[PDB]
Write a protein that holds these residues in place. Sequence first.
Motif, PDB file in Angstrom:
ATOM      1  N   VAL A  37       0.854  -1.187   0.000  1.00 15.15           N
ATOM      2  CA  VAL A  37       0.000   0.000   0.000  1.00 15.15           C
ATOM      3  C   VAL A  37       0.891   1.238   0.000  1.00 15.15           C
ATOM      4  O   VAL A  37       1.506   1.590   1.014  1.00 15.15           O
ATOM      5  CB  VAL A  37      -0.965   0.000   1.185  1.00 15.15           C
ATOM      6  CG1 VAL A  37      -1.726   1.317   1.218  1.00 15.15           C
ATOM      7  CG2 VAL A  37      -1.900  -1.190   1.070  1.00 15.15           C
ATOM      8  N   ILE A  38       0.948   1.918  -1.136  1.00 19.93           N
ATOM      9  CA  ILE A  38       1.853   3.038  -1.345  1.00 19.93           C
ATOM     10  C   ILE A  38       1.037   4.297  -1.084  1.00 19.93           C
ATOM     11  O   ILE A  38       0.229   4.709  -1.923  1.00 19.93           O
ATOM     12  CB  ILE A  38       2.448   3.009  -2.755  1.00 19.93           C
ATOM     13  CG1 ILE A  38       3.261   1.708  -2.939  1.00 19.93           C
ATOM     14  CG2 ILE A  38       3.325   4.242  -2.983  1.00 19.93           C
ATOM     15  CD1 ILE A  38       3.897   1.533  -4.303  1.00 19.93           C
ATOM     16  N   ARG A  52      -0.936  -8.584  10.311  1.00 21.97           N
ATOM     17  CA  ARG A  52      -0.553  -8.890   8.936  1.00 21.97           C
ATOM     18  C   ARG A  52      -0.052  -7.671   8.189  1.00 21.97           C
ATOM     19  O   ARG A  52       0.348  -7.794   7.025  1.00 21.97           O
ATOM     20  CB  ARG A  52      -1.733  -9.485   8.164  1.00 21.97           C
ATOM     21  CG  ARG A  52      -2.105 -10.874   8.606  1.00 21.97           C
ATOM     22  CD  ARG A  52      -3.310 -11.376   7.839  1.00 21.97           C
ATOM     23  NE  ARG A  52      -4.535 -10.710   8.268  1.00 21.97           N
ATOM     24  CZ  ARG A  52      -5.120  -9.720   7.604  1.00 21.97           C
ATOM     25  NH1 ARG A  52      -4.618  -9.262   6.468  1.00 21.97           N
ATOM     26  NH2 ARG A  52      -6.259  -9.205   8.073  1.00 21.97           N
ATOM     27  N   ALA A  53      -0.098  -6.503   8.820  1.00 21.61           N
ATOM     28  CA  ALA A  53       0.387  -5.257   8.257  1.00 21.61           C
ATOM     29  C   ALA A  53       1.724  -4.895   8.891  1.00 21.61           C
ATOM     30  O   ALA A  53       1.971  -5.164  10.076  1.00 21.61           O
ATOM     31  CB  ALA A  53      -0.618  -4.137   8.522  1.00 21.61           C
ATOM     32  N   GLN A  54       2.601  -4.317   8.081  1.00 17.86           N
ATOM     33  CA  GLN A  54       3.854  -3.815   8.612  1.00 17.86           C
ATOM     34  C   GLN A  54       4.360  -2.763   7.642  1.00 17.86           C
ATOM     35  O   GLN A  54       4.238  -2.921   6.422  1.00 17.86           O
ATOM     36  CB  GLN A  54       4.912  -4.920   8.810  1.00 17.86           C
ATOM     37  CG  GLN A  54       5.377  -5.616   7.546  1.00 17.86           C
ATOM     38  CD  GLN A  54       6.415  -6.678   7.832  1.00 17.86           C
ATOM     39  OE1 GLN A  54       7.607  -6.376   8.007  1.00 17.86           O
ATOM     40  NE2 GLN A  54       5.983  -7.935   7.839  1.00 17.86           N
ATOM     41  N   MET A  55       4.869  -1.671   8.201  1.00 16.28           N
ATOM     42  CA  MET A  55       5.581  -0.674   7.426  1.00 16.28           C
ATOM     43  C   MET A  55       6.936  -1.233   7.022  1.00 16.28           C
ATOM     44  O   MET A  55       7.587  -1.945   7.793  1.00 16.28           O
ATOM     45  CB  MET A  55       5.744   0.589   8.279  1.00 16.28           C
ATOM     46  CG  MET A  55       4.415   1.324   8.535  1.00 16.28           C
ATOM     47  SD  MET A  55       3.590   1.960   7.041  1.00 16.28           S
ATOM     48  CE  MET A  55       4.942   2.628   6.108  1.00 16.28           C
ATOM     49  N   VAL A  56       7.362  -0.890   5.804  1.00 10.78           N
ATOM     50  CA  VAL A  56       8.635  -1.362   5.266  1.00 10.78           C
ATOM     51  C   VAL A  56       9.469  -0.187   4.773  1.00 10.78           C
ATOM     52  O   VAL A  56      10.674  -0.323   4.538  1.00 10.78           O
ATOM     53  CB  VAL A  56       8.427  -2.392   4.144  1.00 10.78           C
ATOM     54  CG1 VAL A  56       7.776  -3.676   4.692  1.00 10.78           C
ATOM     55  CG2 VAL A  56       7.615  -1.782   3.001  1.00 10.78           C
ATOM     56  N   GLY A  78      -7.087  -5.599   2.798  1.00  6.58           N
ATOM     57  CA  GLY A  78      -6.857  -6.833   3.540  1.00  6.58           C
ATOM     58  C   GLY A  78      -7.259  -6.899   5.006  1.00  6.58           C
ATOM     59  O   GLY A  78      -6.945  -7.883   5.682  1.00  6.58           O
ATOM     60  N   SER A  79      -7.935  -5.880   5.532  1.00  2.93           N
ATOM     61  CA  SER A  79      -8.357  -5.961   6.927  1.00  2.93           C
ATOM     62  C   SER A  79      -9.453  -7.024   7.108  1.00  2.93           C
ATOM     63  O   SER A  79     -10.170  -7.384   6.162  1.00  2.93           O
ATOM     64  CB  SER A  79      -8.835  -4.593   7.421  1.00  2.93           C
ATOM     65  OG  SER A  79     -10.188  -4.428   7.083  1.00  2.93           O
ATOM     66  N   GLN A  89      -0.846 -10.436   3.160  1.00  2.00           N
ATOM     67  CA  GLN A  89       0.162  -9.678   3.883  1.00  2.00           C
ATOM     68  C   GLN A  89       0.178  -8.275   3.310  1.00  2.00           C
ATOM     69  O   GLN A  89       0.192  -8.107   2.091  1.00  2.00           O
ATOM     70  CB  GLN A  89       1.527 -10.323   3.677  1.00  2.00           C
ATOM     71  CG  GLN A  89       2.700  -9.594   4.287  1.00  2.00           C
ATOM     72  CD  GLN A  89       2.690  -9.477   5.812  1.00  2.00           C
ATOM     73  OE1 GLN A  89       2.914  -8.380   6.372  1.00  2.00           O
ATOM     74  NE2 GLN A  89       2.441 -10.591   6.489  1.00  2.00           N
ATOM     75  N   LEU A  90       0.196  -7.275   4.186  1.00  2.00           N
ATOM     76  CA  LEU A  90       0.175  -5.874   3.791  1.00  2.00           C
ATOM     77  C   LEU A  90       1.498  -5.212   4.148  1.00  2.00           C
ATOM     78  O   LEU A  90       1.954  -5.301   5.299  1.00  2.00           O
ATOM     79  CB  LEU A  90      -0.965  -5.112   4.489  1.00  2.00           C
ATOM     80  CG  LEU A  90      -2.395  -5.530   4.154  1.00  2.00           C
ATOM     81  CD1 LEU A  90      -3.381  -5.144   5.245  1.00  2.00           C
ATOM     82  CD2 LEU A  90      -2.786  -4.939   2.827  1.00  2.00           C
TER      83      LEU A  90
END
Length: 279
Positions: A37-38, A52-56, A78-79, A89-90
Amino acid sequence: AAQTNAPWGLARISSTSPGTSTYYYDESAGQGSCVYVIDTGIEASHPEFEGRAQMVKTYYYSSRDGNGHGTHCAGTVGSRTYGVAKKTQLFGVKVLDDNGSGQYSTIIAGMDFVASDKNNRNCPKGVVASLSLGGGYSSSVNSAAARLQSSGVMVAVAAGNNNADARNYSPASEPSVCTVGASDRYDRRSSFSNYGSVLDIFGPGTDILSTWIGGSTRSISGTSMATPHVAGLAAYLMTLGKTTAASACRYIADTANKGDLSNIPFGTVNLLAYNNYQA
């Protein structure tokens, strides 16, 4: 699977007709895929993402979503309650500041980041990028979206909220990516949605209930909300093995509900994203 009292946009993508309230989907739920998600970030701590979400990546002093836009979109991808692919995976890439703004040069770096960073992740079912952003036409931005697509990622981009032809907007005007218009709960083109031949598909965009920052939820409207529906659908379909990163936009178009939207201008496709799931 069936989600009773799902948000209208989720029910819409699994139904032939508007106005139903249940969301039918295969229980694989996009497990094994990855959607980047940009945007403004993702409040990964939200119970709705189940970790399942993480900043990268961030391009600003913080990677937190101080706006809510990015969290809302990640919610629709994806929630658990508001999402199309409930087991995906987000990955959050923060290219917009907390006002929802970002320089084109930052957006481009973000796209090139995703093209590389997917080789750092386990995404055995393929990779999607959702781009709920845009401004005026830029060949460099279009080119960056084209590279992201070429590198093996299904790129979904908003068409824009100007109620004009999306050819004057980027990345929406890039042919090789999936450009998403917005419709409302009555199968009408959303009043703000851009249009034009560059559009590939429509998604729910009006009064979309999703996650918000502070562990809350809210309903907002935009092609920015339609885009994650199609991004999540893509991830769902690739997990199902029915399509690939390179072919997903065409597949969604092939299998979309045809001719059901009102106020579609001449020259713009009449196609509503649809998962074609049969219990």
